[PDB]
Each structure stands twice: as C-alpha cells, then as structure tokens.
Amino acid sequence: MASLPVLQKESVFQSGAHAYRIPALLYLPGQQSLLAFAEQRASKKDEHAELIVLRRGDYDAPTHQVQWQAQEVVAQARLDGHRSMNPCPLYDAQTGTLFLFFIAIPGQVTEQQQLETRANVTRLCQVTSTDHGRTWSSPRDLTDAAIGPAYREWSTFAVGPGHCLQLNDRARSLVVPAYAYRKLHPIQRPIPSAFCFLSHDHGRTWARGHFVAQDTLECQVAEVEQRVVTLNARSHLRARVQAQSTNDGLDFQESQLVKKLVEPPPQGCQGSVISFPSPRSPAQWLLYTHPTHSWQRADLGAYLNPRPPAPEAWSEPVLLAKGSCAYSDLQSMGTGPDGSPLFGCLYEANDYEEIVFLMFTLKQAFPAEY
C-alpha cells in the first residue's frame, strides 16, 4: 500500500500565479548537481504555456540530499510572440556547452489547430549556456537548419520533452528525441511518429533520422552495450512502444508494443527511460518511470530491464508515488550513498498542481536483485 521509501521526495514546483507542467531533469556529473526544467503556463491548459522555468539542485554528499535554489525563468528561451514549451536540455560533456531545446508556438494557437488544418506553425528552438545555466545565449531558431524540406510534410511536431542524449560514439554526438505528425494520406488524419535529430558537429548542424513505426508520440532515448540506442515512445495503443537503433539514432528497428508497460486509455502519457552501469554480464541496465494505473494517470511506477533491450526482460514496477502522476523524467546520478546506482526523478503530481523531485538508489527500488 505504501509508496516506495526513497532517499528524498520534495515538491520543487507548485501552482501559484502560474501552473507548472512538462518537467525535464539534467544531471551535470562534474558539478554533482541537477538542473530541473519546467513549463510556466498561465493555466493548466496547454494553449496557455508561456515561458520555461529552471531550478538548480546541488547534491550534498554528507547528508545525501539535494538542495534546490530559487526558480528562475530561462528568459532567453523564447521567440517574440510565441509561447515556449517542451524543454529538452542536453549537456555536451566535451564542449561543456549546455543545451536547452524547446518548441515555440505563435500566440495561443493550439496543436489541434495545426492538426485540423494540416498547417504547421511550430518553430524549433534552442538556447545555450557555458556557465551551467547562469546566463543563456540568445535564442537560435533551428527550424530551417533542422527541418526545412520536411516542414510542409508535417502538420506539427515537438522535441522530447525531457533530457536529450549525447552518444559515446566515435564523435560524441547529440541525439534529441522527438516526434512528428506526418501527412501521409490526403483524406486520413496525420499519424505521429517518433524520431531523432542528430548532430555530429557538437551542435553546429543537424539532421533528422528516419521515423520508427507510426502512431508513436513523445519518446526518449538511451544508449546500451555492440552499442545501441533503445527508444521508448508513448503510444495511443494498449501499451508503450519501443525500438532499437544500431546506427546512432538514424534508424530504429524491431519496434514493438510492450504490454508489461501499460498506458492510460485515451492517448497514453509521457514516460522516461535511462540506462546505468549494471551492478554486475551486460554493461548497462535500463530504468523507466511512467504511471502504472491503466484507466488514468496515477501511481507512478519504476521498471527495470536487467537484460536490455529484450522487451520480455522488462520487470514489474515498484510504486514510486500513489495517486495522480503524469509526465516524468529520469536521470542517472552515479553511485548512491549505499553503493548502488543513484536515480533522480522529476514527475507531475496532484493533478498538475505540483511537480515533485524523487531520489532513490537501485538497492531501494529493486532490492530483490541482491
């Protein structure tokens, strides 16, 4: 009945003059601190998104707790007349450049509208920072350099939401998970499909990798041991959809539904996935958070995959939170206070009226594996 006894559970965002949704969590291994991003809307309704907020949490080792600083708006992260949403932070380990990818949309134009009209008006933006988010650069509209030709082919699109991924490939590449509503039938409605924007020049230029099976929405990616990228996407189907890539994000194959990982009725809900050092045959294991209830968005659960990316390998969940739970984001924080893998979790709680930070170790969530 009781939720999982964690290392830490604290409300990091709450409604007030504004409502806060769509959480993102970035871990700076060298700072030993987290960057918590969220959307600051004038109300819970999507069409009311405005700016992106940020909070820095620095991990204290003596007490194994994370102390967060006052929330601030990533001012530079926005385009004139458009509202910003869907944050997708990434940290380029080598250039030390911190990236924040977001989507800018004109006025309060809805997503439904770009859909019904098959008219895309969504801009792809990013802002960078070299002092860990203290001062951001001026907004840079990537739409043309990242899209262009494929712009008319989509009714709309979006990045993440959630932390992006830098590969440990022969060139440490940037992979930004995303999904788009593609126009494939003159009569039938557009079908969304997950995919990743790739950058091999450290952000200089981009490229869109090929789509995966269709009817997949917001997804996230991870890398595992010969070196592959498993993707996990939100589907309007019974459960979650997941595919793997063996060419650094350019192609996703073996895509299939995973019934062990349920999805709420309508169009499902966003979820998060990360990889981490196996406590002992495979180099990495995966951890994934998503609501475990099947009629609604409640009971946030954590799932383990000790033999990735074998779909049947996925484990049964463990209750991280009882009640209303929605969008979440995960981060591997290294080795915890108890010698096991440390995890940082950010999730939408209490009917979108607060976003919570959760911190726990593998030994806590899945002690069985010991």
Enumerate binding residues for ligand DAN (CB under 6 A): 22, 46, 85-86, 111, 158, 217-218, 269
- Annotation says 10 is catalytic: no
Nearer to ligand DAN, 84 or 305 (CB): 84
CB 53 within 8 A of CB 40: yes
Tell me if 179 is assigned to a ligand binding site. Answer: yes
CA distances (Å), 2 to each of 28, 172, 318, 320, 321, in order?
32, 42, 11, 9, 9
Tell me if 234 is assigned to a ligand binding site. Answer: yes
Residue 115: CA atoms inside 13 Å, Cβ hemisphere, count? 12
**CB 326, min distance to ligand DAN, A:** 6
Nearer to ligand DAN, 21 or 55 (CB): 21
Question: Among residues 39, 92, 263, 348, which one is catalytic?
Answer: 348
Tell me if 218 is assigned to a ligand binding site. Answer: yes
- The pair of structure tokens assigned to 6 is 């964690």
Tell me if 55 is assigned to a ligand binding site. Answer: no
CB 206 within 8 A of CB 199: yes
**CB 1, min distance to ligand DAN, A:** 27
Residue 244: CA atoms inside 13 Å, Cβ hemisphere, count? 12
**CB 350, min distance to ligand DAN, A:** 15
Tell me if 297 is assigned to a ligand binding site. Answer: yes
Nearer to ligand DAN, 92 or 111 (CB): 111
- Annotation says 348 is catalytic: yes
Per-residue burial over 162-188, b = 16 or more CB atoms within 10 Å of its CB, e = otherwise = bbbbbbeeeeebbbbbbbbbbbeeeee
Element housing 143 (H / E): helix 143-146
3-class SS of residue 114 = helix
Nearer to ligand DAN, 50 or 218 (CB): 218
Radius of gyration of the chain (CA): 19
| Strand bridging mode 284-291 / 272-277 | antiparallel
3-class SS of residue 48 = helix
- Annotation says 50 is catalytic: no
Nearer to ligand DAN, 220 or 275 (CB): 220
**CB 84, min distance to ligand DAN, A:** 11
| 261 closest CA partner among 212, 301, 229, 320 | 301
**CB 270, min distance to ligand DAN, A:** 7
Question: Among residues 91, 327, 347, 352, which one is catalytic?
Answer: 327
Query: So which residues are the catalytic ones?
Result: 46, 327, 348
Residue stretches of the annotated binding site for substrate: 21, 41, 179, 181, 218, 234, 297
